[PDB]
Amino acid sequence: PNLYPVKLYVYDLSKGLARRLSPIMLGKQLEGIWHTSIVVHKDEFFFGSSGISSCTPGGTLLGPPDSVVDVGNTEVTEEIFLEYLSSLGESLFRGEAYNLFEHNCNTFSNEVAQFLTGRKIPSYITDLPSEVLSTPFGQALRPFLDSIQIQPPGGNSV
Amino acid sequence: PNLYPVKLYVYDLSKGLARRLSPIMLGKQLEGIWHTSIVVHKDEFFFGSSGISSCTPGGTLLGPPDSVVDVGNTEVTEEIFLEYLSSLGESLFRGEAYNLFEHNCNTFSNEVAQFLTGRKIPSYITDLPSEVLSTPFGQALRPFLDSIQIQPPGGNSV
């Protein structure tokens, strides 16, 4: 069977700022504000307030990823993958469903990784929202944080 | 002529946190992360990633506003106002046009206030984005900040 490498592009939206300012804001040590995407079949795929989008790898306003993580290989072909993403985009991943804490770019990548390789992405990435929420900081800014939508420019709808 | 009071609902999304943590993040004293809306004809109107929305005053997830500011009176009736908002929503205020720095909830309220009363809202509110941008903090997080969309839940499309 033809095998296609699957990568998880990792971006620290805070560019290291969350690393030092996290103890002074949340009183807890966070290593970054993780934004991830799935790179497969030569293209980068992510979910934001605009829904599922794609771009050439490292092609958003965010620039090159801070880390490229190997997820595994998948047998899912390009045409089957696009059909899969299309199906998600019309059901559980419309732009309206975006939520900073429970339905974000990492929720997307995690579910996509599982589908393509049977593996989930690292908990330190997906658990970030709960780590922020479980603090006075997070509880006070909950209303504001729940109002936040993220959509890195540069991609086009799938 | 029938006169209708126009209010500017002011919300500090940071709930006072920006007040104390601003000197330690931006090295400059900011008093809040201002989110505003226009209240007229018994309803609250605002612009977000979803476009122009309305709700009963203080009816979003943000709760009651931190301050209610008197803008002035307007002679524009309800039906004419909705037509006005509809026109904006189809031209310069579609959800896609939202930008944290140059086309946000305050850009909307300011333009709406000017139309209804001939007055602009206070510069300390509208100039906030530039104040954050003119700092190492802002320049480093520019990519991330430009990816931020804001849409307080609770309203419905106009």
Swiss-Prot record, chains A, B:
Keywords, in A-Z order: Cytoplasm, Hydrolase, Nucleus, Protease
Motif window: Nuclear export signal 1: 80-88
Positions of short motif Nuclear export signal 2: 136-150
Catalytic residues as annotated in Swiss-Prot or TrEMBL: H35, C105
Assigned EC number: 3.4.-.-, 3.1.2.22
Job description of the protein: Protease which deconjugates SUMO1, SUMO2 and SUMO3 from some substrate proteins. Has isopeptidase but not SUMO-processing activity. Desumoylates ZBTB46. Collaborates with UBQLN4 in the export of ubiquitinated proteins from the nucleus to the cytoplasm. Exhibits palmitoyl protein thioesterase (S-depalmitoylation) activity towards synthetic substrates 4-methylumbelliferyl-6-S-palmitoyl-beta-D-glucopyranoside and S-depalmitoylation probe 5 (DPP-5).
Name of the protein this chain belongs to: Desumoylating isopeptidase 1
Species, as recorded: Mus musculus (Mouse)
